[PDB]
Amino acid sequence: PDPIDRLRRANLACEDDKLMIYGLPWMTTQTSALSINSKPIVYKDCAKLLRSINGSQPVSLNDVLRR
Amino acid sequence: EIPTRTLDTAIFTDASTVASAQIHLYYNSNIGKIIMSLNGKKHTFNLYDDNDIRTLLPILLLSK
């Protein structure tokens, strides 16, 4: 079994300046993305970083793994 | 050796600091961890640890 397979719906979103992760398996609410030093990511320009599948569609982990 | 992936991505090196980086990563299925090489430093992510997952996923999801 691959523990990454239940993460395949994960996608990023910006809630104002907070970078969030949607689509996680066991989670009721979206949770914050963390920096490499384990802090919640807060970024005024959050929306300019988000990647898309050539439409407003957000990139999911499934999309990344199948590239 | 375990095969690697190479990604061009953006990494939040602090809560509000982002930097472009190329990383090499691999998945060790015996221990359930992803190991990442970033500018000569090794980072380990336990895929059973939700805190580690919340750190790994933005790195993968901002990748080209």
Short mmCIF file of C-alpha atoms in Angstrom, two decimals:
data_model
loop_
_atom_site.label_atom_id
_atom_site.label_comp_id
_atom_site.label_asym_id
_atom_site.label_seq_id
_atom_site.Cartn_x
_atom_site.Cartn_y
_atom_site.Cartn_z
CA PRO A 1 0.00 0.00 0.00
CA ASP A 2 1.08 3.55 -0.78
CA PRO A 3 0.14 6.05 1.96
CA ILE A 4 0.32 8.77 -0.72
CA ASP A 5 -2.67 7.41 -2.63
CA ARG A 6 -5.29 8.76 -0.22
CA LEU A 7 -3.66 12.22 -0.60
CA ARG A 8 -4.39 12.40 -4.33
CA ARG A 9 -7.29 14.85 -3.97
CA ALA A 10 -5.12 17.37 -2.12
CA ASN A 11 -5.09 20.85 -3.66
CA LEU A 12 -3.98 24.31 -2.55
CA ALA A 13 -6.20 27.33 -2.03
CA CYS A 14 -5.66 30.86 -0.75
CA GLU A 15 -8.02 32.13 1.96
CA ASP A 16 -7.04 35.78 1.82
CA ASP A 17 -3.32 35.41 2.58
CA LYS A 18 -3.42 31.96 4.21
CA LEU A 19 -2.26 29.05 2.07
CA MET A 20 -4.60 26.13 2.76
CA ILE A 21 -4.80 22.46 1.76
CA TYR A 22 -8.22 21.17 0.64
CA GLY A 23 -9.18 17.60 -0.14
CA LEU A 24 -7.28 15.70 2.54
CA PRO A 25 -8.86 12.32 3.38
CA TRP A 26 -9.75 12.23 7.04
CA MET A 27 -10.14 16.02 7.45
CA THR A 28 -13.45 17.78 8.18
CA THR A 29 -11.95 21.26 7.71
CA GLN A 30 -9.19 22.58 5.48
CA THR A 31 -5.87 22.89 7.26
CA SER A 32 -2.93 25.20 6.75
CA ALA A 33 0.00 24.44 4.52
CA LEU A 34 3.27 24.54 6.48
CA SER A 35 6.62 26.04 5.58
CA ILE A 36 9.79 23.96 5.70
CA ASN A 37 10.39 25.19 9.26
CA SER A 38 6.87 24.11 10.29
CA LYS A 39 4.99 27.40 10.32
CA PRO A 40 1.59 28.14 8.74
CA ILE A 41 2.17 29.82 5.38
CA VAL A 42 0.95 33.44 5.25
CA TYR A 43 1.65 35.22 1.98
CA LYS A 44 0.12 38.41 0.60
CA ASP A 45 0.82 37.20 -2.95
CA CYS A 46 -0.54 33.69 -2.30
CA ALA A 47 -2.84 33.65 -5.34
CA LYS A 48 -0.01 34.32 -7.83
CA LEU A 49 1.75 31.07 -6.84
CA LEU A 50 -1.17 28.67 -7.35
CA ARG A 51 -0.92 26.36 -10.37
CA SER A 52 -3.75 25.36 -12.68
CA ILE A 53 -4.53 22.58 -15.16
CA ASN A 54 -4.83 25.14 -17.99
CA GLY A 55 -8.14 26.36 -16.56
CA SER A 56 -9.10 27.94 -13.25
CA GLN A 57 -9.13 24.27 -12.15
CA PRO A 58 -6.76 23.82 -9.19
CA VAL A 59 -3.90 21.36 -9.53
CA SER A 60 -4.38 18.25 -7.39
CA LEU A 61 -1.70 15.89 -6.15
CA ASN A 62 -3.15 13.35 -8.59
CA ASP A 63 -2.33 15.76 -11.43
CA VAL A 64 1.24 16.19 -10.18
CA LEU A 65 1.86 12.45 -9.83
CA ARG A 66 0.43 11.68 -13.30
CA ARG A 67 2.43 14.32 -15.17
CA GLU B 1 19.30 2.71 -5.47
CA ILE B 2 15.75 4.04 -5.18
CA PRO B 3 14.76 5.98 -8.32
CA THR B 4 14.32 9.71 -7.83
CA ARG B 5 12.11 12.44 -9.18
CA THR B 6 13.37 15.94 -9.94
CA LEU B 7 11.02 18.91 -9.56
CA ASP B 8 11.26 22.63 -10.20
CA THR B 9 9.16 24.29 -7.53
CA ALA B 10 8.76 27.08 -4.97
CA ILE B 11 9.56 26.47 -1.32
CA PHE B 12 8.44 28.46 1.71
CA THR B 13 11.67 28.61 3.68
CA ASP B 14 9.82 30.58 6.38
CA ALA B 15 6.18 31.46 7.03
CA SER B 16 6.22 34.36 4.54
CA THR B 17 9.40 33.76 2.49
CA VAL B 18 9.38 31.89 -0.82
CA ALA B 19 12.29 30.80 -2.99
CA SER B 20 12.53 28.94 -6.28
CA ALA B 21 14.37 25.63 -6.09
CA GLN B 22 15.08 22.42 -7.95
CA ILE B 23 14.75 19.38 -5.68
CA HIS B 24 15.49 15.67 -6.02
CA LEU B 25 13.18 13.37 -4.09
CA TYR B 26 12.50 9.69 -3.61
CA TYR B 27 9.97 7.48 -1.86
CA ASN B 28 11.15 4.75 0.51
CA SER B 29 8.23 2.32 0.59
CA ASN B 30 9.81 0.17 3.32
CA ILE B 31 9.55 3.00 5.86
CA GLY B 32 6.80 5.16 4.33
CA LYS B 33 8.88 8.31 3.94
CA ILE B 34 9.77 10.74 1.18
CA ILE B 35 13.34 12.05 1.30
CA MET B 36 14.11 15.39 -0.37
CA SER B 37 17.38 17.03 -1.31
CA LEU B 38 17.19 20.84 -1.21
CA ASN B 39 20.39 22.86 -1.69
CA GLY B 40 22.55 20.19 -0.10
CA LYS B 41 20.27 19.55 2.89
CA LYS B 42 18.26 16.38 3.51
CA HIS B 43 14.61 16.65 4.54
CA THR B 44 12.54 13.62 5.54
CA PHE B 45 8.74 13.47 5.41
CA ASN B 46 6.83 10.72 7.20
CA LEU B 47 3.73 10.03 5.09
CA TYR B 48 1.84 8.83 8.18
CA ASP B 49 2.41 12.18 9.93
CA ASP B 50 -0.12 14.88 9.05
CA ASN B 51 2.29 17.65 10.03
CA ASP B 52 4.90 16.27 7.64
CA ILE B 53 2.22 15.90 4.93
CA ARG B 54 1.17 19.54 5.35
CA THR B 55 4.84 20.51 4.77
CA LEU B 56 5.43 18.20 1.79
CA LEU B 57 2.22 18.94 -0.11
CA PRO B 58 2.80 22.67 -0.85
CA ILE B 59 6.24 21.74 -2.23
CA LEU B 60 4.74 19.19 -4.61
CA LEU B 61 1.65 21.22 -5.48
CA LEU B 62 3.58 24.37 -6.47
CA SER B 63 5.87 22.34 -8.76
CA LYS B 64 6.14 22.69 -12.52
#
